[PDB]
């Protein structure tokens, strides 16, 4: 598993792979690891798939109830705080999950990282999963806050491809998402076996 | 029940043309001591159901008590309905599984026989809640020694008569007596038929020790 | 492992803490803030286990602010330190223990400046200078060597710079930047970050 | 410990030894292991002393109350099936084996054995205890149908003495009790009267 | 000590077509090195257009299949409709996660027809996570059956499905897997769910 | 695995199956488990395959040397002695269980040897994983002084019961008949199981696979 | 496990008057790739090859000791080795280190230097020969290869169909294994030539 | 396993059962546990089959060589001592108990017991095996001095049958041997002839 | 010797005016079974030394044959020199300690008595090599039950007589029979004096069970 | 944990390693050298357990120099790598194992530059660029991204600088200075240290 997310002038960009394994056996290569919480929030999965899916569904229903009651949409900080408080009460039992939460609100773009141990940190560049250490290198060498849209797309695709090249539990296809002011859109889903000829030549 | 203590050995069962027959020995062993030698491990539930259980004996007695009271209570109403063998099989499976999940199992393996509405029933329930049905059954070491003999016969001739099933039962008991360390030479048989449930015993098997002279 | 230091002078309290948030073998944040404001003249610095720190600190902050709002006057530093110690000690023996190490810095209009030390077993001590972390070993000897009760603000900042340069030279962990704050009769003032 | 009971036409004979050890030290050597549950019902006890004593007291209480309500002398089967539920309900805690013996007008003199685990079974002769493994063949070879009261008081003493000579946890004196319609006869065989 | 689980073997397979679905399994029940039965199928009919298959520990299979049917009747009485395949999958996920700290030791596959009349296959893990696929195999010989399906259906590494072709493919893959897997194969049960309802079929395998 | 042996009025009959597994996956479907030891002595092995192979080869070579020096046919007691002494020397780390049998100037002899160096002399023996399912058949249907064909049928039934009732046993049945005047080695004797016929045609046409590099080395 | 520390996959298949041996190309330490062009198939004669899968250090050690012994044998005897004799030699070499075994499982494939009759076989950890007539597999992805080969193999294959069959089996088998893959190398051994090819596979 | 030997004026009587189990499965049911070390010396074996068989073979070898050198029939005490030396040397490895019994012209018919640990002692009657705990009282009560040759075969058969009925590891047939000056008499008691 | 198996209970010893007396019972227990009931655990070494051992009986039997040959070999020289009681005490301490350090101990406790040159010797050797001398000795459970009883007499009257010591050594076998679970009612006594070594037994003790009637 | 990197170009080999010697939580030395010279054109870089590194490296150096002195010509890089692998593999299974990770860089007048990788289990690989340590994870992706087979010396030094700046930014350990060397047809050249 490797998922990354970075924040720049025109919003947030999220990228993920698609392989899921059970031991040394590859169960599937069509997993959708960017969880679509709302038309205005995005979340990722890393660690346990069941835990991420269940607790982010609970978060989605709480967000909808809040919006119904208060006639206003929830913010990214509040959503991350809710998710952090729902998993601290099962501390030590054995949950395993680490998620970025991405959105846009009154204070601009937002990108938070929450994991089951208890951390909740805001940032401008995150990567989680087994192959994250391979994506930090490329992303750090290429990242700047004044990137254009196409340049940011290219950076995310290249970072994920380089992560899957050297990691054994990472692979499949690269799924890309862009969070803007008026909601998110789905950019592309590119197969690694074609990025190989695109990049090498 | 974390430890078995006094235990039973094995139960045998086979279905024939018009009913079911079940067989079990009369010994309760405490480890390797062969302590109680005239105990009965076969029950008659109602006029068309019989039960035979192996494993811990205290748990078997407890289930006897519960099942007997349930049958009496359901008979008091006098409404014209009675439990079939399948209802007993399902209730036993539920009870065993419900007690497994509390981490406090009942150390038993049970064979239910019955004959109702022109159809005969032979079912198997396990300690963890694994339950199923078959034309022939054996628990414990009988699963290794006696099951091949029953299945060899049942593959060639799917449908037996009463005398053939009886004779097959004594042959299996003799083999078990020869090759099992916790067995005994006195056993007991129960037969369920259109007439009802009939228990016969104690019986005995004739053995052969000719090979002792070629040693 | 995080680093906290506090120095207590004649009419101020100076505190400093590092700005790294690290997970495994990689740094994930380099502008982390470990300094919670409980009042206009009370700071509480917390380090330790992940998750426990923020839960404990936010609980304390809520209760202190509620005292302010109900009663019309604010808690003194001593009472806040005692409240914190009692709340950690009560949870020590229950099923939900907190693994946190704490420094509390404050100013009182009659009792002057105050600096308090607390470990994870909830024993409360009052010190003229204190430190938490693995750098405490490397730093407390310099602080003992060069500290006087009459030290002034610029001299205190120079002494803090000496301690942080020692950490740069000898210590094996990468701690590039530190955040520094001061508490005085005019409130809490944020000083320039010390960076290398 | 070695306890035994034998049936004869008209009653039962109970016998026991009198040693209680704690490791390899004989804490008591004149123990009384025959306790009257009711005027005609006795139990022989083996295992932990605390468990057996507490269960005997509880069953005595319950059986007495039942008898006062019903206005009748109780049955041996009732006492055995009061011991059985307490021994089965707490089988993960108690470590106790019991022999129940008595005389009731409905079925004469009877004997039941409640071993560890809460089992119940009726027998013509029943032995129990740690030292009873050494007299299984003897009682199998010597017992016969139609024994008299005095041929059962002598067979019991012989079996108990044979168990005493070989077991390390059995010793002391031999306590015998005969139960029939007229009453209960109790006696003790000291060192001179013990068979050799 | 006491172990609350055993492994009873079993293989389940599902293929989704243009206007059909197929769910297949074997009928052997085993334990350890012994054989309990040769006539124990692992497919359960949920609705006239929905079938479920379970494998793993047998007691959990029985109790789970009873719970699912009770919940379906509850839903039909409360909502005056028959539950849909997607709704069945979404409810099973929650049921499975309810036992997160004492899990069911079951592998589940759901096959059927969706609301536009096309085949649907959903696969689950023992904890609840589910996914919609085009074909899926689970149980003892999943690792042997999956590459064949990837090669023949997905056309991997090569330079529509009819019903008959899918039937032949299913029979072939189980015939091949009976050769090498210890736990698999006394008879083969196939359930085809289509516009007209659910049809059943049986085939014979090796016996040793 | 399942190995069995019986003594009839004129000699020995030994039988075994042919499946070899590794874990819960069938590795070999035509394994051979009846080993040559001498022109009149044979062995059936169970347990770890490598240990039985090396043990039988070593003992066979030693008996060959002994028979060359003395000039006579060897005896089953000699092979039993060397096997049991070597197995006891290793304190049970050689997981070999052996059914040994032969005919010499004294008559038919049949032994069973365990991994720790024990030995039994018996008129019928079984070993393996499916040893109980065949011992049931021997207890049911054995008589002293049978003929050749009756003994062959009995051994076949025992091995078939072991095959059909146990997961670790399967495939074919092998028989070896040792008599004073002959030695028959039937391979195979019965084929109870057959592979089903394939329905589809999955032949890969030429040009389906893409190739990066290629080189030709003319010998 | 120790056999899965480095990964690896090798297989051999028999045709009509020809044999094929294939292996994957990857050297890594658990979940991290180090190199791609790692050698696992070694020639032991004009028309005889051996493939090693398992732990890389043991792979190289076994290959070098086997070449040592084979060279000495061929110098003394004055002829080429036979596939039976090579299998027995490898079994002896592996059993000598019982209780301290090398963590490899070899696969041997060749032609008889006198009659050119195909021979394929495989040995286990401690050297138990197991000769087949159709195909042998070895490595971390054995189940996938068994599944593919039981369905694709058919008797009397000419070199072209044999090459296609082994290519498809190896590709589809290693596509489902996480710690094997990233290239496939195939050798076709025939009477009068040897053909070496490298296949186009996924690199992720 | 149950083995026993009894002394009478002029020789010894040896008896054994014939069952060998592996867990709860009867691997062999016609085992012969009486092995002749020499012409008139026998051993009865209990414990691990491998250890007892190997030790019996080694002692047979040594005793035969000693007898050939000395040009005399050996003594029972010599064989008991050889067994004792081997059993004591390897007591951390072997699990074997043995009864040695024979007749020599110097001292008559004698019996020695070599239990686990390599101890050695002479007795009038000696029982051993796993199933011998159930017949201690019987042999204590029934044995008397001056028994004839035919009164020792019946006593042995009775004790062995009583041990067989109660033990799970004992069964099969009863093998008896009588050793005196004239020779050795061997017999087997099948199912009909076993006492009931 | 990692495990003791068949064991002895306790040995008593006391010195009087002109010699030493030692006592021990005749029983070897295998666990808690009281298996061998006529075994002697007292040895006579030479004409002025006697030995008594408790613990594993195989080890005592081994030491007995090792110490008998060492005495036989020295009397063959015919030179007028014999081992003192103290020489065997010193040799035994070395033999115990040399096997303690190899992690292969000899599971025994040893009591040596002797009388040479008008001076009495009573010595104690342990499993680990702890060795010493005292006016009275008891090993095992006699160190708790019998030692308080002898060490009360040997302070009021430091010098006993032969009859006073013989009565004292039998008052202690009765208390040790009442309250020890591995005891027996048949013991054996050895006495060394100017004449030589005298062994007397088996003896027996008279008991009192009056308190059984106050229960 | 120490860091080694090597890059292999058309006619040179560039290698770099850090200069820290740390014990516990404090840095003992900051100019440590981990680059052993086996010949005029062979370098061997070693990291790992304390003690094993220097013993293994000095043994290899002695043997290589002895080959030179006996034969009159020097070992090629390939033969030295094979010699090292055999000597580590032999000791793997003995009672004295070495826990060392190795890179070997060399130049041959006919085969060109060469770079070899070896882990502690003695598996030898040949790579165009390689790394050891915890920084290998952070660095190998940059090297894959920006490396070409035709890279020149200045470009290689720039790429190395990129990798070390990445280590400075992301990695948690304090690694201030690195030593850099190059091997070419003119021998071994020491380049300027890269420091931050």
UniProtKB/Swiss-Prot annotation, chains B, I:
The 26S proteasome consists of a 20S proteasome core and two 19S regulatory subunits. The 20S proteasome core is a barrel-shaped complex made of 28 subunits that are arranged in four stacked rings. The two outer rings are each formed by seven alpha subunits, and the two inner rings are formed by seven beta subunits. The proteolytic activity is exerted by three beta-subunits PSMB5, PSMB6 and PSMB7. Forms a ternary complex with SMAD1 and OAZ1 before PSMB4 is incorporated into the 20S proteasome. Interacts with PRPF19. Induction: Up-regulated in fibrolamellar carcinomas. The lineage of its organism: Eukaryota, Metazoa, Chordata, Craniata, Vertebrata. This is Proteasome subunit beta type-4. Its main location: cytoplasm. It is found in: Cytoplasm; Nucleus. GO terms for cellular component: ciliary basal body; cytoplasm; cytosol; extracellular exosome; mitochondrion; nucleoplasm; nucleus; proteasome complex. One of its GO terms (biological process) is negative regulation of inflammatory response to antigenic stimulus. It comes from Homo sapiens (Human). Keywords: Acetylation, Cytoplasm, Disease variant, Host-virus interaction, Nucleus, Phosphoprotein, Proteasome. One of its GO terms (molecular function) is lipopolysaccharide binding. Belongs to the peptidase T1B family.
From Swiss-Prot, chains C, J:
InterPro entries: Ntn_hydrolases_N, Proteasome_beta2, Proteasome_bsu_CS, Proteasome_sua/b, Proteasome_suB-type. GO terms for biological process: proteasome-mediated ubiquitin-dependent protein catabolic process. It is found in: Cytoplasm; Nucleus. Non-catalytic component of the 20S core proteasome complex involved in the proteolytic degradation of most intracellular proteins. This complex plays numerous essential roles within the cell by associating with different regulatory particles. Associated with two 19S regulatory particles, forms the 26S proteasome and thus participates in the ATP-dependent degradation of ubiquitinated proteins. The modification N-acetylmethionine is found at residue 1. The keyword Cell cycle does not apply. Transmembrane segments: none annotated. PROSITE patterns: PROTEASOME_BETA_1, PROTEASOME_BETA_2. The keyword Nucleus applies. This is Proteasome subunit beta type-2. The 26S proteasome consists of a 20S proteasome core and two 19S regulatory subunits. The 20S proteasome core is a barrel-shaped complex made of 28 subunits that are arranged in four stacked rings. The two outer rings are each formed by seven alpha subunits, and the two inner rings are formed by seven beta subunits. The proteolytic activity is exerted by three beta-subunits PSMB5, PSMB6 and PSMB7. (Microbial infection) Interacts with HIV-1 protein Tat. One of its GO terms (cellular component) is nucleus. Belongs to the peptidase T1B family. It holds the Pfam family Proteasome. Induction: Up-regulated in ovarian cancer cell lines. It comes from the Eukaryota.
UniProtKB/Swiss-Prot annotation, chains D, H:
It catalyses: Cleavage of peptide bonds with very broad specificity. It is found in: Cytoplasm; Nucleus. Induction: Down-regulated by IFNG/IFN-gamma (at protein level). Up-regulated in anaplastic thyroid cancer cell lines. It is an enzyme of class 3 (hydrolase). GO terms for cellular component: cytoplasm; cytosol; extracellular exosome; mitochondrion; nucleoplasm; nucleus; proteasome complex; proteasome core complex. Keywords: Acetylation, Cytoplasm, Host-virus interaction, Hydrolase, Nucleus, Phosphoprotein, Protease, Proteasome, Threonine protease, Zymogen. Its EC number is 3.4.25.1. GO terms for molecular function: cadherin binding; endopeptidase activity; threonine-type endopeptidase activity. Component of the 20S core proteasome complex involved in the proteolytic degradation of most intracellular proteins. This complex plays numerous essential roles within the cell by associating with different regulatory particles. Associated with two 19S regulatory particles, forms the 26S proteasome and thus participates in the ATP-dependent degradation of ubiquitinated proteins. This is Proteasome subunit beta type-6. The gene is PSMB6. The chain holds residues 35 to 230 of 239 of the full protein.
Swiss-Prot record, chain F:
It comes from the Eukaryota. GO terms for molecular function: endopeptidase activity; threonine-type endopeptidase activity. It is an enzyme of class 3 (hydrolase). It catalyses: Cleavage of peptide bonds with very broad specificity. The keyword Cytoplasm applies. It is found in: Cytoplasm; Nucleus. GO terms for cellular component: cilium; cytoplasm; cytosol; extracellular region; ficolin-1-rich granule lumen; nuclear body; nucleoplasm; nucleus. Keywords: Cytoplasm, Host-virus interaction, Hydrolase, Nucleus, Protease, Proteasome, Threonine protease, Zymogen. The active site is at 1 (nucleophile). The keyword Nucleus applies. GO terms for biological process: proteasome-mediated ubiquitin-dependent protein catabolic process. Expressed at a low level in colonic mucosa. Up-regulated in colorectal cancer tissues. Its EC number is 3.4.25.1. Component of the 20S core proteasome complex involved in the proteolytic degradation of most intracellular proteins. This complex plays numerous essential roles within the cell by associating with different regulatory particles. Associated with two 19S regulatory particles, forms the 26S proteasome and thus participates in the ATP-dependent degradation of ubiquitinated proteins. Belongs to the peptidase T1B family. This is Proteasome subunit beta type-7. The lineage of its organism: Eukaryota, Metazoa, Chordata, Craniata, Vertebrata.
């Amino acid at each position: 598993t490797t998922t990354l997310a970075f924040k720049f002038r025109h919003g947030v960009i999220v990228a993920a792979d698609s392989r899921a394994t059970a031991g040394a056996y590859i169960a599937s290569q069509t997993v959708k690891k960017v969880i679509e919480i709302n038309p205005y929030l995005l979340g990722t999965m890393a660690g346990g798939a069941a835990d991420c899916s269940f607790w982010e569904r609970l978060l989605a229903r709480q967000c909808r109830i809040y919006e119904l009651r208060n006639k206003e949409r929830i913010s990214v900080a509040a959503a991350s705080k809710l998710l952090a408080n729902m998993v601290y009460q099962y501390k030590g039992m054995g949950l395993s999950m680490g998620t970025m939460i991405c959105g846009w609100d009154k204070r601009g773009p937002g990108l938070y990282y929450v994991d089951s141990e208890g951390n909740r940190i805001s940032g401008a560049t995150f990567s989680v999963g087994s192959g994250s250490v391979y994506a930090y290198g490329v992303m750090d060498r290429g990242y700047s806050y004044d990137l254009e849209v196409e340049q940011a797309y290219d950076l995310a695709r290249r970072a994920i491809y380089q992560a899957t090249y050297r990691d054994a539990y990472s692979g499949g296809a690269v799924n890309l998402y862009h969070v803007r002011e008026d909601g998110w859109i789905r950019v592309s889903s590119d197969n690694v076996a074609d990025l190989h000829e695109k990049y090498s030549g | 029940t974390q430890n078995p203590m006094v235990t039973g050995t094995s139960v045998l069962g086979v279905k024939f043309e018009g009913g079911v027959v079940i067989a079990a020995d009369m010994l309760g062993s405490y480890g390797s001591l062969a302590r109680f030698r005239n105990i009965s491990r076969i029950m008659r539930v109602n006029n068309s159901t019989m039960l035979g259980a192996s494993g811990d004996y205290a748990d078997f007695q407890y289930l006897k008590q519960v099942l007997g009271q349930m049958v009496i209570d359901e008979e008091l109403l006098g409404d014209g309905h009675s439990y079939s063998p399948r209802a007993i099989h399902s209730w036993l499976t539920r009870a065993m599984y419900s007690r497994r999940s509390k981490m406090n199992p009942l150390w038993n393996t049970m064979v239910i026989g019955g004959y109702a509405d022109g159809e005969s029933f032979l079912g198997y329930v396990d300690m963890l809640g694994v339950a199923y049905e078959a034309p022939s059954l054996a628990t414990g070491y009988g699963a290794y020694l006696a099951q091949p003999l029953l299945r060899e016969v049942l593959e060639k001739q799917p449908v037996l008569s009463q005398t053939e099933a009886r004779d097959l039962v004594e042959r299996c008991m003799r083999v078990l007596y020869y090759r099992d360390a916790r067995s005994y030479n006195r056993f007991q048989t129960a037969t369920v038929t259109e007439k009802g449930v009939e228990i016969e015993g104690p019986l005995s098997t004739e053995t052969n020790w000719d090979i002792a002279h070629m040693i | 492992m995080e680093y906290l230091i506090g120095i207590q002078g004649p009419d101020y309290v100076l505190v400093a803490s590092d700005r790294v948030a690290a997970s495994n073998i990689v740094q994930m944040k380099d502008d982390h803030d470990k300094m919670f404001k409980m009042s206009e003249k009370i700071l509480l610095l917390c380090v330790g286990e992940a998750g426990d720190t923020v839960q404990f600190a936010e609980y304390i902050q809520k209760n202190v602010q509620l005292y302010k709002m109900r009663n019309g006057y604010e808690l003194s530093p001593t009472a806040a330190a005692n409240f914190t110690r009692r709340n950690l000690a009560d949870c020590l023996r229950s099923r939900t223990p907190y693994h946190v190490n704490l420094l509390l810095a404050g100013y009182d209009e009659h009792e002057g400046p105050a600096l308090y030390y607390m470990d994870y077993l909830a024993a409360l001590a009052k010190a003229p200078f204190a430190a938490h972390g693995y750098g405490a070993f490397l730093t407390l000897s310099i602080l003992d060597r060069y500290y006087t009760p009459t030290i002034s603000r610029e001299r205190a900042v120079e002494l803090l710079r000496k301690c942080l340069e020692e950490l740069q030279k000898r210590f094996i962990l990468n701690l590039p930047t530190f955040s520094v704050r001061i508490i005085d009769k005019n409130g809490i003032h944020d000083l320039d970050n010390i960076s290398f | 410990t070695t306890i035994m009971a034998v049936q004869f036409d008209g009653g039962v004979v109970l016998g026991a030894d009198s040693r209680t050890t704690t490791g390899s030290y004989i804490a008591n050597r004149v123990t009384d292991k025959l306790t009257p549950i009711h005027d005609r019902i006795f139990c022989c006890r083996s295992g932990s002393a605390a468990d057996t004593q507490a269960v005997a007291d509880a069953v005595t209480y319950q059986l007495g109350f039942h008898s006062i309500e019903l206005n009748e002398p109780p049955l041996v089967h009732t006492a055995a099936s009061l011991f059985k539920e307490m021994c089965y309900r707490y089988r993960e805690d108690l470590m106790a084996g019991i022999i129940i013996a008595g005389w009731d007008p409905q079925e004469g003199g009877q004997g039941y054995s409640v071993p560890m685990g809460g089992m119940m079974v009726r027998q013509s002769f029943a032995i129990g205890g740690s030292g009873s493994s050494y007299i299984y063949g003897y009682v199998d070879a010597t017992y016969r149908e139609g024994m008299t009261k005095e041929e059962c008081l002598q067979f019991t003493a012989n079996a108990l003495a044979l168990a005493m000579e070989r077991d390390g946890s059995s010793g002391g004196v031999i306590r015998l009790a005969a139960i029939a319609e007229s009453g209960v006869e109790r006696q003790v065989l000291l060192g001179d009267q013990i068979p050799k | 000590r006491f172990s609350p689980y055993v492994f009873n073997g079993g293989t389940i397979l599902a293929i989704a077509g243009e206007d059909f679905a197929i769910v297949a399994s074997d009928t052997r029940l085993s334990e350890g090195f012994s054989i309990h039965t040769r006539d124990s199928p692992k497919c359960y009919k949920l609705t006239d257009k929905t079938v479920i298959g379970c494998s793993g520990f047998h007691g959990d299979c029985l109790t789970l299949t009873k719970i699912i049917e009770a919940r379906l009747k509850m839903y039909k009485h409360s909502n005056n409709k028959a539950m849909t395949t997607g709704a069945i999958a979404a409810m099973l996920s929650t049921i499975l996660y309810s036992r997160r700290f004492f899990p069911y030791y079951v592998y589940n596959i759901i096959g059927g027809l969706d609301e536009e009349g096309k085949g649907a296959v959903y696969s689950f893990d023992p904890v609840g996570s589910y996914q919609r696929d085009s074909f899926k195999a689970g149980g003892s010989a999943s690792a042997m059956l999956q590459p064949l399906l990837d090669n023949q259906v997905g056309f991997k590494n090569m330079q529509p499905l009819s019903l008959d072709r899918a039937m032949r493919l299913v029979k072939d893959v189980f015939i091949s897997a009976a050769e090498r897997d210890v736990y698999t194969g006394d008879a083969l049960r196939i359930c085809i769910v289509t516009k007209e309802g659910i049809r059943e079929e049986t085939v014979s395998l090796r016996k040793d | 695995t399942t190995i069995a042996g019986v003594v009839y009025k004129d000699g020995i009959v030994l039988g075994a199956d042919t499946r070899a597994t590794e874990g819960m996956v069938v590795a070999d479907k035509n394994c051979s488990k009846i080993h040559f030891i001498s022109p009149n002595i044979y062995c059936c092995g169970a347990g770890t395959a490598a240990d039985t192979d090396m043990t039988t080869q070593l003992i066979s070579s030693n008996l060959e040397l002994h028979s060359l020096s003395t000039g006579r046919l060897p005896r089953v007691v000699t092979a039993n002695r060397m096997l049991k002494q070597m197995l006891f020397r290793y304190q049970g780390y050689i997981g070999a269980a052996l059914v040994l049998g032969g005919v010499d100037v004294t008559g038919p002899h049949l032994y069973s040897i365990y991994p720790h160096g024990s030995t039994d002399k018996l008129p019928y023996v079984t070993m393996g994983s499916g040893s109980l399912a065949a011992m049931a058949v021997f207890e049911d249907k054995f008589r002293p002084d049978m003929e050749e064909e009756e003994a062959k049928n009995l051994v076949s039934e025992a091995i078939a019961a072991g095959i059909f009732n146990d997961l670790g046993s399967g495939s074919n049945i092998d028989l070896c008949v040792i008599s004073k005047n002959k030695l028959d080695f039937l391979r195979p004797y019965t084929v109870p199981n057959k592979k089903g016929t394939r329905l589809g045609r999955y032949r890969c046409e030429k040009g389906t696979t893409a190739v990066l590099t290629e080189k030709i080395t003319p010998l | 496990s120790i056999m899965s520390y480095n990964g690896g996959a090798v297989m051999a298949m028999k045709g009509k008057n020809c044999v094929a041996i294939a292996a994957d190309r990857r050297f890594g330490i658990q979940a991290q790739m180090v190199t791609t062009d790692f050698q696992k198939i070694f020639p032991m004669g004009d028309r005889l090859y051996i493939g090693l899968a398992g732990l890389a250090t043991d792979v190289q050690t076994v290959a070098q000791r086997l070449k040592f012994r084979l060279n000495l044998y061929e110098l003394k005897e004055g002829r080429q080795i036979k596939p039976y004799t090579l299998m027995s030699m490898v079994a002896n070499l592996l059993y000598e280190k019982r209780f301290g075994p090398y963590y490899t499982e070899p696969v041997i494939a060749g032609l008889d230097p006198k009659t050119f009759k195909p021979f394929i076989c495989s040995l286990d950890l401690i050297g138990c020969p197991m000769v087949t007539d159709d195909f042998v597999v070895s490595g971390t992805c054995a189940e996938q290869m068994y599944g593919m080969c039981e369905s694709l193999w058919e008797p009397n294959m000419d070199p072209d169909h044999l090459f296609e069959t082994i290519s498809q089996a190896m590709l589809n088998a290693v596509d489902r294994d996480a710690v094997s893959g990233m290239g496939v190398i195939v050798h076709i051994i025939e009477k009068d030539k040897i053909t070496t090819r490298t296949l186009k596979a996924r690199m992720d």
